[PDB]
A paper describes a structure:
A large body of evidence suggests that PBD interacts with phosphoserine/phosphothreonine (pS/pT)-containing motifs, and directs the N-terminal catalytic activity to specific subcellular localizations. The polo-box domain consists of two different binding regions, such as the unique, broader pyrrolidine-binding pocket and the conserved, narrow, Tyr-rich hydrophobic channel, among the three Plk polo-box domains (Plks 1–3), respectively. The N-terminal Pro residue on PLHSpT is crucial in conferring specificity by docking its side chain into a unique hydrophobic core (hereafter called the pyrrolidine-binding pocket), which is surrounded by the Trp414, Phe535, and Arg516 residues.
Finally, in an attempt to determine the molecular basis for the enhanced binding affinity on [name], we solved the co-crystal structure of [name] PBD in complex with [name]. More importantly, the crystal structure of [name] PBD in complex with [name] further reinforces our detailed understanding of the unique binding nature of the pyrrolidine-binding region, showing that the hydrophobic interactions between the adamantyl moiety and the unprecedented, new PBD-interacting elements, such as Arg518 and Gln536, played an important role for the specific tight binding into the broad, pyrrolidine hydrophobic pocket. Notably, the side-chain conformation of Arg518 rotated by around 120 degrees to accommodate the hydrophobic adamantyl moiety presented to the pocket. Furthermore, the above two PBD residues were either not identified in the previous crystal studies due to the high flexibility, or they reside in the reverse direction of the peptide chain. Thus, the crystal data indicated that the bulky adamantyl substitution in [name] acted as a site-directed moiety that prevented the N-terminal Pro motif from turning into the narrow passage of the Tyr-rich hydrophobic channel. As expected, PL-42 and [name], having bulky N-terminal substituents like trimethoxy-substituted benzyl or the adamantyl group, buried into the broader pyrrolidine-binding pocket, which was confirmed using X-ray crystallography, and has been shown to participate with the newly identified unique PBD residues that mediate hydrophobic interactions.
Author numbering:
A (entry chain B): 3 to 8
B (entry chain A): 372 to 499, 508 to 593
Write the structure that this text describes.
């Protein structure tokens, strides 16, 4: 992923 | 930066084969007094152009730029700390800063605004300034090494996380259901743990080796 969890 | 101590701590626990016990008593290894003060609650990998942005559990935010410099914004929303590649620390504010830092400050603001409005906050239901010294990502996790010696490993597929704190010789594990538990590594060695956590700790040792080899 490119960012932490949504 | 305490990495050698952490490696020894992990080696000891892993060598004791914690998941291979007549009776695993993981709960007996918990130690509420070792709960970490800081951990990374959110992050954004924009390293293709600027760097790694992140938020700490106290709502402060920071960025480890591609040029190896760091900019941290305290949770008061104005106090700032700049750390050069050499580690030289400087202090200022969003309202009073040198023009040379305008770009990096604007970039941090963008990161802050985004993380503040998006993404879940890790460890939100837990009540606990360092900067990000080093970070890297593997195919299965992101590894974050803080200046206070802590090492955090977030696993991508199942969302589990480890927060290793060498001063306390402790490790916090956040499982899939977001249960937040802090353990003393010496007690995990004595009482054991489940196969899942044992596997994460073996992986952690390998990640620490990487931080040492870097
Ligand atoms: C990340 C790394 C692999 C696992 C998952 C999905 C894809 C491949 C991107 C996160």
């Amino acid at each position: 992923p490119l960012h932490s969890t949504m | 930066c305490h990495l050698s101590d952490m490696l020894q701590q992990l080696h000891s626990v892993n060598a004791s084969k914690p998941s291979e016990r007549g009776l695993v008593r993981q709960e007996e290894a918990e130690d509420p007094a070792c709960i970490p003060i800081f951990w990374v609650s959110k992050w954004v990998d924009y390293s293709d152009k600027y760097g790694l942005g992140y938020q700490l559990c106290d709502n402060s935010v920071g960025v480890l730029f591609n040029d190896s410099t760091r900019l941290i914004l305290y949770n008061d929303g104005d106090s700032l700390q700049y750390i050069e590649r050499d580690g030289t620390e400087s202090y200022l504010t969003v309202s009073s800063h040198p023009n040379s830092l305008m770009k990096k400050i604007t970039l941090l603001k963008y990161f802050r605004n985004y993380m503040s409005e998006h993404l879940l906050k890790a460890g939100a239901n837990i009540t606990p300034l360092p900067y990000l010294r080093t970070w890297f990502r593997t195919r299965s996790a992101i590894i974050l090494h803080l200046s206070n010696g802590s090492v955090q490993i977030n696993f991508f597929q199942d969302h589990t996380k480890l927060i290793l704190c060498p001063l306390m010789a402790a490790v916090t594990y956040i499982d899939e259901k977001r249960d937040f538990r802090t353990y003393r590594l010496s007690l995990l060695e004595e009482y054991g743990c489940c196969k899942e956590l044992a596997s994460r700790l073996r992986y952690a040792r390998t990640m620490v080796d990487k931080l040492l080899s870097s």
